[PDB]
RNA sequence: CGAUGUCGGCUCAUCACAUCCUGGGGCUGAAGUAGGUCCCAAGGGUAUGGCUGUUCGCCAUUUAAAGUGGUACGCGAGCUGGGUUUAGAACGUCGUGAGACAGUUCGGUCCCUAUCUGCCGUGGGCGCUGGAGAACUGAGGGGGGCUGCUCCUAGUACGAGAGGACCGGAGUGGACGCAUCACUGGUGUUCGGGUUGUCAUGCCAAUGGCACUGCCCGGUAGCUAAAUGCGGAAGAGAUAAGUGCUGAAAGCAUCUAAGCACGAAACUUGCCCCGAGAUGAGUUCUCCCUGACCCUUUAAGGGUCCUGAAGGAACGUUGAAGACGACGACGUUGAUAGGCCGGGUGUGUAAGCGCAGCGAUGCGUUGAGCUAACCGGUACUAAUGAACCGUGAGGCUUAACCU
RNA sequence: AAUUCCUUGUCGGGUAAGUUCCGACCUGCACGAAUGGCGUAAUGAUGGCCAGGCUGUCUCCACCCGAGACUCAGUGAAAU
RNA sequence: ACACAGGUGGUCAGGUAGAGAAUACCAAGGCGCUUGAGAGAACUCGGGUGAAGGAACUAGGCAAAAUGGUGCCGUAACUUC
RNA sequence: AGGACCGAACCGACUAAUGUUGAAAAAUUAGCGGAUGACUUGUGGCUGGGGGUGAAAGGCCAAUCAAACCGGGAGAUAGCU
């Protein structure tokens, strides 16, 4: 069935997605862009764009929810002084997700996902 | 559950029928260097749509 | 669904009381008695409110000769009057079904006041 | 008389002055336009072909779109078919609206299933489930039996088992219609018809009412 | 859903606590019982003195369901626990005169006349 | 006997008619209601429990009725193992004894990923004669087919009373099936909140992890039922048992021999679904292609260059579609999905700070903060322009109209 | 009756209904006194039965979370 | 038989909560188990929750569900006391 | 004090499910009994095939027991296949 219910399982335990979108969205913030399958791609989007959308706006109560998600300071000091300023006038979009190939191994289709604006 | 008499050649090639691969054999040149590839995928050095989107 | 929520608009009325739920409403309903409407009244403290637009609905608790009655209330219909409030009270949940196994002076609310 | 093709869009509730709740069904209807006039001197039949909705320029396929432009009308999102029921003459590029059904107070509704999948023999046909405990081993949503024995050899055509339920054509009958909108273009039939929320449903008057 | 093996009280002024429906009368296979719908029940505790004894097995109606019953503009009277009313198992004619607990408009059908006028409240 | 596994129960059934109910009739020791019996009829329906391992049966309470059988007394490559025929033990009896018992009792491993046939669903190839895109007719087939009670007719007919209809027509239920979340609820480990233990975020504060989601309380969408709608039919044709008309053979009589008329939930349709691989491969509408040279045992032949159309497929973003294919929408001439914004819903008065208080904590800011797939908008991100397949007016014989 | 074939004996109790269960009568097919007879507090992963509680065992399942199943890449069996 | 969810004697064995070497979360130290990546059907297995009823299930309350600690009050028949 | 009670290690193995071409030629998960003794366990010995040992099942004696395994008699014999 699952009609109308937008959400991946990635075959883990729900306590391992939390964890894996969290550190994984870390290293996204960190470096710029990051390679990936598709469907960790297609996802990873939904969780650092609302990051992107919040430290939109700088505030003490912005700091502790842009904390609870993420767990790191480093993330979050990279945010709201890089991210925040950065993609302020654009409304909408904050990352790009881009297929290249496949891996030797599992033979996964991959993907580039990549903040924008990157031509510094 | 096993099998009672042994199946032919020929049982074995029909069910191969469909087994058969198929190539993509309809790629793109893309618009900057023209190497060949996979549409919506990105070169090999890092070109797509006519454009470095590797940046490095 | 703008055809439905400009239809769900027509059947609504324009008055309705809100409230917060924890408050001793007293509510009053059409009971039809072969041809008369008759204009009921029930009181109790209100357990729920399912607020959907036209489709609202609250429960009411009444601790009545008997056991206990509750009675729901598709909130813009034609039958239900009176939203009238007696007790505003003060609790933290939203909805409050806890009170269906605490009795008497045990299932007695603060009012609100504030 | 005929029918008409409709859109269904969610579905409410109208309230009497009784407040007796009526459940009802909100039926988007434009405008049926007919594109053909099939004839028992050209066919061997007598029936309409409508369409209804908004097509797009690269969209419209180069074969419909003389299709439509042989009569000459705005392309709608595919076609349908009516038969005539009597001697009911129509013209090509006829618009059919809904003030058909201010008269008629039964109506029908056809429309594709809101597909459930690959259904199992207990939600499929309603199969008692075997027993969850006091022994059972692997077998506890199972269908158990499917023949007899040697004297059959083989299962009966036509099985209850487990297979596709859903994204198929069901005809809900004999609705009573609540309000005929003529401005909004609405239908409010009493009740649930088939398929999910955009599905199609082509209403028909009730046929055995 | 009252239906068999289901542990009702009573609601009237009979003599017995705890009865137990036995049967839902009214059709083949039919499942529970509902709103005002004839049941046959068993009497499984008593008062000393009273009219039926322990043991006994008489006709009941059902008054007020834990499930609660539908008005026809989708609201509920769902009540807090189950509870009957005793009848003659040879008439209409309920053995209670005091009927406690407030009972539904539903019931109101000409034949249970009789129990809606005792009735305290609804 | 180089293996055919066994009673009962669960599950799933299917056919037969010697029919339990409903339907249509004859006869009656048939007044009426209710029954007895026989004939036609298999469309559908055809109990829940206490006791026994039991089928059966007895009993209690119903129901319109709780039919009889075939089907390895259907079903263990579907389940259970209670009973019974492995190994232990005891009692009664039999025997000197080992042991034995159509006597009994307590306990005691139920194996297998389906090649084929069959059945349930779903696709690929090719064919359908130029190709492609849509819409239907329709042979064949399947599903569905149950019924009570109350009321009106009328408390009339019938009956000394007691009692109490047929037919016809409304309303309200049970069982079963289809469909759907607007209502009422269920789940809702992607949402909010409370709290215990402990570790960590340098520390307070504030959060996160882990302990089945730690335990809980609620709850959006979706799914779904106990929820909400709907369904059986009416009518028609031809008939069964049966009932009559006219009417001879047989001056009469007589349903039958010629001819004619009524007559069942059964048969064929009417209702709904599948459906042109119906190779008997149908029909209608529309769209697109009307380029040049050689060889040849010169034939519906083969080859080359020039164009490769409609359309399809592939790929991509995905769907209330879905196991995989497939099917539907969209592909910037853009609303398909993600994001963003407004709204809604849910949870509930966040964080920080101020004040009161020794403190836990409360009040104020504030029905705020946070808000999952929900609704309506918006190209910010991704659906890149091409390429690949498919062609170039469509054979033979004959007839009928144009010329 | 770990014993009674007849037999579900008969009567009583428990239940709406009790081939089991508890008490009793005695026609003990075929109990019986150290192959011990009759009781017996406690004990028991013991046999039978009843009641309270409690719940998806069941009426009748519904949904959800993970591991296979299903698809793709690599390796690649088996009874027969 | 294998780089096999098995078997294998003795010793040391911290912090917080706790009666405890139970158990939970961590320290030091050592590991993520030598196939993975998607999709999110039936069905199977390990589990969660549940309207009304509550054994109606069944050979049988099998399995689940429930009870569950400390302090105190109170505690029957029978008995070898 | 106790062949005492609840309950880990340790020992044992009653119920259910999974597994039964298994992870495993008897185990795993959730429960369960004993748990200061007639206990359990390490190391080293002793008792042997019509014999050993046995809280006694005709169980155990190297995955084998109403008479172990290996070699020889032996190409036993077979009215049977
Ligand atoms: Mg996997
Ligand atoms: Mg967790
Ligand atoms: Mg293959
Ligand atoms: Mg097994
Ligand atoms: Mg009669
Ligand atoms: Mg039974
Ligand atoms: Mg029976
Ligand atoms: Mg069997
Ligand atoms: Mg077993
Ligand atoms: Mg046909
Ligand atoms: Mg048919
Ligand atoms: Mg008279
Ligand atoms: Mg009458
Ligand atoms: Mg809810
Ligand atoms: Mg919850
Ligand atoms: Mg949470
Ligand atoms: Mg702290
Ligand atoms: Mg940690
Ligand atoms: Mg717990
Ligand atoms: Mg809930
Ligand atoms: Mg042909
Ligand atoms: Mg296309
Ligand atoms: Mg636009
Ligand atoms: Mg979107
Ligand atoms: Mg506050
Ligand atoms: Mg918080
Ligand atoms: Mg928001
Ligand atoms: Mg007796
Ligand atoms: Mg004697
Ligand atoms: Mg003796
Ligand atoms: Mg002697
Ligand atoms: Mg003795
Ligand atoms: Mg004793
Ligand atoms: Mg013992
Ligand atoms: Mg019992
Ligand atoms: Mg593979
Ligand atoms: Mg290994
Ligand atoms: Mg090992
Ligand atoms: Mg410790
Ligand atoms: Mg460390
Ligand atoms: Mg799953
Ligand atoms: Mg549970
Ligand atoms: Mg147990
Ligand atoms: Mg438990
Ligand atoms: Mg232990
Ligand atoms: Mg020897
Ligand atoms: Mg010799």
């Given at each position: 069935m699952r009609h109308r219910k937008s959400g991946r399982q990635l075959n883990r335990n729900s306590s391992h997605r939390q964890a894996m979108f969290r550190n994984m969205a870390g290293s996204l913030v960190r470096h710029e862009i990051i390679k990936t399958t598709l469907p960790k791609a297609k996802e990873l989007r939904r969780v650092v764009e609302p990051l992107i959308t919040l430290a939109k706006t700088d505030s003490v109560a912005?700091?502790?929810?842009?904390?609870?998600?993420?767990?790191?300071?480093?993330?979050?000091?990279?945010?709201?002084?890089?991210?925040?300023?950065?993609?302020?006038?654009?409304?909408?979009?904050?990352?790009?997700?881009?297929?290249?190939?496949?891996?030797?191994?599992d033979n996964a289709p991959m993907a580039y996902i990549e903040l924008v604006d990157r031509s510094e | 559950a096993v099998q009672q008499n042994k199946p032919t050649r020929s049982k074995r090639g029909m069910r191969r029928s469909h087994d058969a691969l198929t190539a993509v054999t309809s790629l793109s040149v893309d618009k900057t260097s023209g190497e060949k590839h996979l549409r919506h995928h990105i070169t090999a050095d890092g070109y797509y749509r006519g454009r470095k989107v590797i940046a490095k | 669904s703008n055809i439905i929520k400009q239809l769900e608009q027509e059947q609504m009325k324009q008055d309705v009381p809100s409230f917060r739920p924890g408050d001793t409403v007293e509510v009053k309903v059409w009971v039809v008695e072969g041809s008369k409407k008759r204009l009921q009244a029930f009181?109790?403290?209100?357990?729920?409110?399912?607020?959907?637009?036209?489709?609202?609905?609250?429960?009411?608790?009444?601790?009545?000769?008997?056991?206990?009655?509750?009675?729901?209330?598709?909130?813009?219909?034609?039958?239900?009057?009176?939203?009238?409030?007696?007790?505003?009270?003060?609790?933290?949940?939203?909805?409050?079904?806890?009170?269906?196994?605490?009795?008497?002076?045990?299932?007695?609310?603060?009012?609100?006041?504030? | 008389m005929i029918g008409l093709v409709g859109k269904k869009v969610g579905m409410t509730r109208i309230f009497t002055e009784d407040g007796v709740s009526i459940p009802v069904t909100v039926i988007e209807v434009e405008a049926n336009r007919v594109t053909q006039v099939?004839?028992?001197?050209?066919?061997?039949?007598?029936?309409?072909?409508?369409?209804?909705?908004?097509?797009?320029?690269?969209?419209?396929?180069?074969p419909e779109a003389g299709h439509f432009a042989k009569a000459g009308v705005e392309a709608g999102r595919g076609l349908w078919e009516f038969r005539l029921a009597e001697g009911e003459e129509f013209t090509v590029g006829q618009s059919i609206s809904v003030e058909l059904f201010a008269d008629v107070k039964k109506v029908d509704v056809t429309g594709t299933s809101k597909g459930k999948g690959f259904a199992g023999t207990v939600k499929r046909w309603n199969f008692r489930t075997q027993d969850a405990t006091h022994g059972n081993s692997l077998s506890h949503r199972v269908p158990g039996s499917i023949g007899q024995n040697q004297t059959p050899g083989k299962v009966f055509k036509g099985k209850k088992m487990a297979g596709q339920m859903g994204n198929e054509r069901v005809t809900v009958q004999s609705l009573d219609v609540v309000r005929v909108d003529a401005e909004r273009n609405l239908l409010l039939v009493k009740g649930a018809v088939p398929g999910a929320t955009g599905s199609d449903l082509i209403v028909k008057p009730a046929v055995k009412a | 859903m009252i239906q068999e093996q289901t542990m009702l009280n009573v609601a009237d002024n009979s003599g017995a606590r705890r009865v137990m429906c036995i049967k839902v009368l009214g059709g083949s296979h039919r499942r529970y019982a509902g709103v005002g719908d004839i049941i046959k029940i068993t009497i499984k505790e008593a008062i000393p003195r009273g009219k039926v004894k322990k043991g006994d097995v008489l006709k009941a109606v059902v008054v007020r369901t834990k499930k609660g019953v539908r008005r026809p503009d989708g609201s509920v009277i769902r009540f807090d626990g189950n509870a009957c009313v005793l009848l003659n198992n040879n008439s209409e004619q309920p053995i209670g005169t005091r009927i406690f607990g407030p009972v539904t408009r539903e019931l109101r059908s000409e034949k249970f006349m009789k129990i809606i006028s005792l009735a305290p409240e609804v």
């Open positions: 912005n700091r502790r929810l842009a904390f609870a998600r993420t767990r790191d300071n480093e993330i979050v000091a990279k945010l709201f002084n890089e991210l925040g300023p950065r993609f302020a006038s654009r409304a909408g979009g904050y990352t790009r997700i881009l297929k290249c190939g496949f891996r030797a191994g | - | 009181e109790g403290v209100v357990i729920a409110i399912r607020n959907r637009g036209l489709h609202s609905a609250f429960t009411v608790r009444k601790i009545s000769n008997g056991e206990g009655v509750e009675r729901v209330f598709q909130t813009h219909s034609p039958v239900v009057d009176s939203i009238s409030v007696k007790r505003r009270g003060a609790v933290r949940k939203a909805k409050l079904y806890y009170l269906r196994e605490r009795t008497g002076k045990a299932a007695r609310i603060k009012e609100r006041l504030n | 099939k004839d028992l001197a050209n066919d061997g039949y007598r029936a309409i072909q409508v369409t209804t909705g908004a097509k797009k320029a690269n969209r419209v396929t180069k | -």
